[PDB]
Amino acid sequence: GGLTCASAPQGTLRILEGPQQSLSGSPLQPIPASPPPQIPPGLRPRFCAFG
Amino acid sequence: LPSARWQYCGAPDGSQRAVLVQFSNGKLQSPGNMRFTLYENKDSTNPRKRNQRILAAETDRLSYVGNNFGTGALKCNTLCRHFVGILNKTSGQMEVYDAELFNMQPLFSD
């Protein structure tokens, strides 16, 4: 009436919960790159010679 | 690839559990001569104690004891859950039951 060893298991199942990968879009930056410093339009000379 | 239809007949009240044993010192060469006795805590009113169980295995030379509580209770019994699947090869149906894992260890007292 006691507990005895039974037949060895024939296989093992290991369960884990996993989600999946999306598409590669690689959206690097809101406003991207190093935007260049640049000329103010027209500007004009702010200096003249004497005479 | 070979697959089986999964069914959790499981435990009617969840009170029912199977019993898995693992020996800390390896595999038993002759598990057929071992007598296992499962002990349960008499206190059924304390939810903490009501699930405490001791599994004892007796051989001619040594005794093994496993418990599901205290230091001997190990992390795998909770972080993970163990089940036993009984596969009917003919029907392809796998019946799945809750299992309790006991880590067995040798008995000596001063």
From Swiss-Prot, chain A:
It is found in: Nucleus, Nucleolus; Chromosome. Residues 18-41 are annotated as: Disordered. Disulfide bonds: none annotated. The modification Phosphoserine is found at residues 26, 34. It is in an antisense orientation to and overlaps the gene of the DNA repair enzyme ERCC1. This gene overlap is conserved in mouse, suggesting an important biological function. Component of the RNA polymerase I (Pol I) complex consisting of 13 subunits: a ten-subunit catalytic core composed of POLR1A/RPA1, POLR1B/RPA2, POLR1C/RPAC1, POLR1D/RPAC2, POLR1H/RPA12, POLR2E/RPABC1, POLR2F/RPABC2, POLR2H/RPABC3, POLR2K/RPABC4 and POLR2L/RPABC5; a mobile stalk subunit POLR1F/RPA43 protruding from the core and additional subunits homologous to general transcription factors POLR1E/RPA49 and POLR1G/RPA34. Forms a heterodimer with POLR1E/RPA49. Part of Pol I pre-initiation complex (PIC), in which Pol I core assembles with RRN3 and promoter-bound UTBF and SL1/TIF-IB complex. Component of RNA polymerase I (Pol I), a DNA-dependent RNA polymerase which synthesizes ribosomal RNA precursors using the four ribonucleoside triphosphates as substrates. Involved in UBTF-activated transcription, presumably at a step following PIC formation. Belongs to the eukaryotic RPA34 RNA polymerase subunit family. This is DNA-directed RNA polymerase I subunit RPA34. It comes from Homo sapiens (Human). The chain holds residues 103 to 153 of 510 of the full protein.
UniProtKB/Swiss-Prot annotation, chain B:
In normal conditions, deacetylated by SIRT7, promoting the association of RNA polymerase I with the rDNA promoter region and coding region. In response to stress, SIRT7 is released from nucleoli leading to hyperacetylation of POLR1E/PAF53 and decreased association of RNA polymerase I with the rDNA promoter region. Its main location: nucleus. GO terms for cellular component: fibrillar center; nucleolus; nucleoplasm; RNA polymerase I complex. Keywords: Acetylation, DNA-directed RNA polymerase, Nucleus, Phosphoprotein, Transcription. One of its GO terms (biological process) is nucleolar large rRNA transcription by RNA polymerase I. One of its GO terms (molecular function) is DNA binding. It is found in: Nucleus, Nucleolus. The keyword Transcription applies. The modification Phosphoserine is found at residue 30. Belongs to the eukaryotic RPA49/POLR1E RNA polymerase subunit family. Component of the RNA polymerase I (Pol I) complex consisting of 13 subunits: a ten-subunit catalytic core composed of POLR1A/RPA1, POLR1B/RPA2, POLR1C/RPAC1, POLR1D/RPAC2, POLR1H/RPA12, POLR2E/RPABC1, POLR2F/RPABC2, POLR2H/RPABC3, POLR2K/RPABC4 and POLR2L/RPABC5; a mobile stalk subunit POLR1F/RPA43 protruding from the core and additional subunits homologous to general transcription factors POLR1E/RPA49 and POLR1G/RPA34. Forms a heterodimer with POLR1G/RPA34. Interacts with POLR1G. Also binds UBTF/UBF. Interacts with PWP1. Component of RNA polymerase I (Pol I), a DNA-dependent RNA polymerase which synthesizes ribosomal RNA precursors using the four ribonucleoside triphosphates as substrates. Appears to be involved in the formation of the initiation complex at the promoter by mediating the interaction between Pol I and UBTF/UBF. This is DNA-directed RNA polymerase I subunit RPA49. It comes from Homo sapiens. The gene is POLR1E. The chain holds residues 6 to 115 of 419 of the full protein.
